Design a protein around this nucleic acid. Sequence first.
RNA 1: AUUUCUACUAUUGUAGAUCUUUUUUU
Length: 1072
Amino acid sequence: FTNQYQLSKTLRFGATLKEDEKKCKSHEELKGFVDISYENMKSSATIAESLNENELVKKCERCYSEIVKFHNAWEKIYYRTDQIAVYKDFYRQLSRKARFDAGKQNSQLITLASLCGMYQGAKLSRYITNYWKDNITRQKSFLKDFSQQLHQYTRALEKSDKAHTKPNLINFNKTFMVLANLVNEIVIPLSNGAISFPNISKLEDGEESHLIEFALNDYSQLSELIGELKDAIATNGGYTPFAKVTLNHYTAEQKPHVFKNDIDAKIRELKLIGLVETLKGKSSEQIEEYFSNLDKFSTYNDRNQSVIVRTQCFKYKPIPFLVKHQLAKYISEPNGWDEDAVAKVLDAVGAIRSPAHDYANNQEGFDLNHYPIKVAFDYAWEQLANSLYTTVTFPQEMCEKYLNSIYGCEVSKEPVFKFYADLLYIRKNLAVLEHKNNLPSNQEEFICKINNTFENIVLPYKISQFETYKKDILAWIHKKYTDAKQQLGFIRGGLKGYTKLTNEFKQISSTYGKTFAELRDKFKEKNEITKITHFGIIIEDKNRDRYLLASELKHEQINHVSTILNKLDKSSEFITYQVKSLTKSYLLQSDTISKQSIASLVEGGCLLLPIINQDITSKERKDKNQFSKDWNHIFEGSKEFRLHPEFAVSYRTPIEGYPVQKRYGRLQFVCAFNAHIVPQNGEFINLKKQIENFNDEDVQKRNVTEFNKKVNHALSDKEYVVIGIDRGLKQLATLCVLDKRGKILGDFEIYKKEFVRAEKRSESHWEHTQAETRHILDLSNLRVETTIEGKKVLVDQSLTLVKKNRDTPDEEATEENKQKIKLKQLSYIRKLQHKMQTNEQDVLDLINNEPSDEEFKKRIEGLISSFGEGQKYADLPINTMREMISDLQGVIARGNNQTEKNKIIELDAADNLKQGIVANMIGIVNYIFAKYSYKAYISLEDLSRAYGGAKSGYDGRYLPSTSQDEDVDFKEQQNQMLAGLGTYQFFEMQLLKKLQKIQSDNTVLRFVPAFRSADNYRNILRLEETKYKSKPFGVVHFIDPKFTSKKCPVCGDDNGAYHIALKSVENLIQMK
RNA sequence: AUUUCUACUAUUGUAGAUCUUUUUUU
């Protein structure tokens, strides 16, 4: 089952030596130099923790309010596929982030309504709106979490004695950084103008004023406030990029000044310096007045103008993502201007203004000569078209004068214009009947108006089969309806034929596009040469202590690469490894450098960073992590385990008030080495080939079919077992191993730890003794643990007591394991939710008079049966239960939206136990799989039901916020499990990722076929069921939950594991 | 006590887990 694909890992190592007692001194051969380098790097690591917790809370509260406002506004607009339009560069970014093949788009501004093309059964616009919908749901989750944290934090600051409620500042930092990434992922595209609203000038205030206000917002303040907090967090516990080191000396000697002249040429093609010099120094309002004071037609028809000025005189078109910032820097620095005063000017080109909003705002300062030709033309044309059938607020004289100037004749008196007005009015009336969400009851009035409008249309020119469209539209009031309606739309939109202006904009836009694509390409190739900022080599002293000697790649001066490699000889005590590769193309070359050479290099200004790990630097240096094993296997020199030449070294600053012993009290650098597992046994599937396969659907279908054919042939004839993993009401998960005939197999021996103190304190150890024997594992509290004799055993962590205050060796263990009481409280929460579903009234009655916590517990004991442990109602989570019942109260107040209530009934309370319990479960499943010599099948639930049917919009990649199952009885039985959909889907995906890359002994095995990781659960929906309703995926067998139910095992919730394993046994036998 | 996560012990720590361009049009 050897892996034929190239795999990658990112091995991360520390780089700040922990000078402490109770930590073995390491890297002490060159320790002196290490110290110097550290105090060099602190000189660059800037920090000012001066922001008191009060001011941090002030900034956080303001940011939360702004983010909530923006999020509420955006929640109503992401799905407007008819108004949104993304630029080409951002469209490609979408097609990478969301996963769809971009196709070939003819236009620069790709309106989402024009992405009618299909891709694997869904429109291309549905992929984008689904990606935005998922982003919004995650924003909601993190806003809720961050609001709770901020509330507890400021409550703690209020009552100075109540410091116990201060949230863990680690989680505070991490939650805000995740929330800021989510928010910025949409605020940035709106801020710089990639997500645009091109129909903004035709729109009317009233029913669509919210969209206009959202199109005209200023996201400078919100973005700057998020930036303020991100800096504040990066100054007290936040990771902040330090360098990107390369280990190849041919990637470090490139000159980045090759492209310079070229870029300047393109800049002189845009006459940008003149524009920026003319505009810099003005405020945004002054720039607006300058642009609104230009002569529009004269500048547009003036061919000697820069294409930017002419475009802004025709249309609001922003400068792209990818050039703007680098262009501001590249314009400022040669000329000595302020960088920000130029970025402001480049932000001021393409700022949307709506003529209608301006006119409603003030009726005296209005004038149509302010706006570009297209915007003013659209406003005048559609307002004049609407004025023939409704009374509107704008005075027709200026619009008529504008159109008369454009065409040279009275536009409102042409038959073509009246025909356009009639078609538009018919479209407006048809829109009401085609919005089935809010159907009225006065259909007769609309139909009478529609008939009269069709009757009174006087066709200005001979148009063919128009009456066919008329009769179809009348007949419907269904596919023929849409066809005729769209053909009427084509005829209506073609009535403006003005064609001279658009013909000129053809050439203007072609030049504006070619020049900016040349700039973008030159910048992209320039910023992959200035990305690397150091050249480093790994160094081993005599005790296998590895340091990284990194020298600055000064672009302002000759670099030191030649002075590092002129000290590497063949006879010296320190070994040096440096990588040489080109993309059988890799070499890890070793030389030696003496101590005087390192001394001179470091005094010259280079950096020396220890590479620290718990196993690399322990007193016996036995490797027990996988990262340490891979570290010591990379430097064996082989080619099947490769080191990627460049890696990013970062750092995080200390948190105030933490002890220096803790890793959060120390300025901690981090190296991020990158390793490739590339086979040599034949033609390995290159990563590009993997990507191409992942894009193709049929390649995947053939691949999965052939892989499970390999498995079935290589395993069916041999003696194998079936490992069925199932959820549980009381047990988080449950594992049963059946024989291929169906008999229950396995007698697992569960152990128990105990720390025995030795007379010499340095040799204390945990002594494992057998405590239980079981044949159905309770995967909640187990963990696979290595005895000091070398054996691997399964221990039950709930059987051992822990200590109240840690680091009290003299005291005796009293408390209960924290994960155990977390699962206790999780079962209580599940009980509460199942009680809400059936007795929402008996749940809401719990808070009749704001009961005190003792009274709240007394009332809870009425509804929810106790856990059944030693102590009844021991660790009841009164706080979380109270803030879930109050949330249900708030939902049922504002109406009784069933979906909004299921957002609470199915909250998946196990989401903080996820990362910790799934690791244990993966460890145990790996242990049992490798116990039976990899000749075993895995048998898992198929969560596909929770993603609705084929009709539903959920393709699988994005988790539903609420389960979309059709049954109510089954959806109720799946809402009582400890592991929600998110938790159990996370476990399943982690297990598949684990099976894809099993490392048995210095080798990599594979049992699931080319599972594309970034696509969460489509890989399982897309599979083909056998005729027994089980989806085979390599070793794994995804079994539908509902169709696994039979006579109970002769031999409560372990029979579930037995029944999944038994159904897989039966299906596998019936296969052959 | 940690590259980091989780549960710990006080064992100079332990156990599992860990990545080219292309406008106006529905």
